[PDB]
């Protein structure tokens, strides 16, 4: 279909991929660091979702350099993805409104 809509979809699939990969890499980067809690996959996936959405309750977070780098990628992917959906919705309302004004 239209670009903005295809990009929205792509952004969603790519976000899902980043969440999964991020959950995997977070554990890989955090184990070995005493005190770390982001060390099992199920909760790591929960952590990735709350980072991507930026809710960040604070029940889980990386304590190592690599874990934090993984976290930044997750945050940026989430922020970008959600922002790209907003823009797609804007491009949609703008076009429809152009019609309603017979332009």
């Amino acid at each position, epitope marked *: 279909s239209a670009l903005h809509w295809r990009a929205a979809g792509a952004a969603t699939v790519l976000l899902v991929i980043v969440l999964l990969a991020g959950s*995997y890499l977070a554990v*890989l980067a955090e*184990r*070995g*660091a*005493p*005190g770390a809690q982001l*060390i*099992t*996959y199920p909760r790591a996936l929960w952590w990735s979702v709350e980072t991507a959405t930026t809710v960040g309750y604070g029940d889980l977070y990386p304590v190592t350099l690599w874990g934090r780098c993984v976290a930044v990628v997750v945050m940026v992917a989430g922020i970008t993805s959600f922002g790209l959906v907003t823009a797609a919705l804007a491009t949609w309302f703008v076009g429809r409104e152009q019609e309603r004004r017979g332009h």
Partner: antibody, heavy 118, light 106 residues
Framework: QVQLQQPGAELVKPGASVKLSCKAS????????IHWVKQRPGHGLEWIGE????????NYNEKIQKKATLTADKSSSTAFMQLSSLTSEDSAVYYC???????????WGAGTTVTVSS | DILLTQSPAILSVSPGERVSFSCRAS??????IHWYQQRTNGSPRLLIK???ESISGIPSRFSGSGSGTDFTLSINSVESEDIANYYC?????????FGSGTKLEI
């Protein structure tokens, strides 16, 4: 069927080193970690270290003296633990266990009795 | 590093009673505690995961409760086969650690 196969025993001369093996079977996932646990006769379970085969990284118990080096062979699904320059203090049963990345040791090996003697 | 205290180290119970093993963590670890049974000359065997979750193939008379720093492993109607050492293990913070263990005696 036995998910983790370990040799029953290994005799080692003080100062020498031995390479313990652990052959896995059953389901295998990229998220599996193989752990090694040391148990001296009459004592408790002491965590040695862990390794993630699909990636090859290993972590070790920082509280104890490092005597182990962990590796894994993906094709043969075998995890190894190289114990080096051992002494009588290193004599114990060494178990290997599989953790599905969710924190608990779902299964253990029968264990390998290591004896350091001349 | 999280310390897991298992006291008493030995429990003397009569056949058929309900016995309770205690496990205390040096800090709050939610429900990330797992229990293992090791009979004489046997390897450890998972009994309960995450403080209270059943494991298939394990007698229903085994149960666990607790959260935070205090955990309990219970056995309803104890019997000869339950004679062994019982260990708790935490997976809340790296590295994973084990309790000193508790022996069941009938």
């Amino acid at each position: 069927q036995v998910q983790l196969q370990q040799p029953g025993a290994e005799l080692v001369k003080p100062g020498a080193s031995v390479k313990l093996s652990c052959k896995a079977s059953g389901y295998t996932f990229t998220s599996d970690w193989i752990h090694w646990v040391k148990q001296r006769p009459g004592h408790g379970l002491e965590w040695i270290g862990e390794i993630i085969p699909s990636y090859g990284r290993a972590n070790y118990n920082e509280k104890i003296q490092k005597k182990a080096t962990l590796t894994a062979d993906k094709s043969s699904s075998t995890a190894f633990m190289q114990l080096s320059s051992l002494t009588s203090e290193d004599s114990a049963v060494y178990y290997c266990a599989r953790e599905r990345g969710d924190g608990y040791f779902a299964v253990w090996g029968a264990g390998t009795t290591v004896t350091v003697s001349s | 590093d999280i310390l897991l205290t298992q006291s008493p180290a030995i429990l003397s119970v009569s056949p058929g009673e309900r016995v309770s093993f205690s496990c205390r963590a040096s800090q709050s670890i939610g429900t990330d505690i797992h229990w293992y049974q090791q009979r004489t000359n046997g390897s450890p065997r998972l009994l309960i995961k995450y403080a209270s979750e059943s494991i298939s193939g394990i007698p229903s008379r085994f149960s666990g409760s607790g959260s935070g720093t205090d955990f309990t492993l219970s056995i309803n109607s104890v019997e000869s086969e339950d004679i062994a050492n019982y260990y708790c293990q935490q997976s809340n913070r790296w590295p994973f650690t084990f309790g000193s263990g508790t022996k069941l005696e009938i």
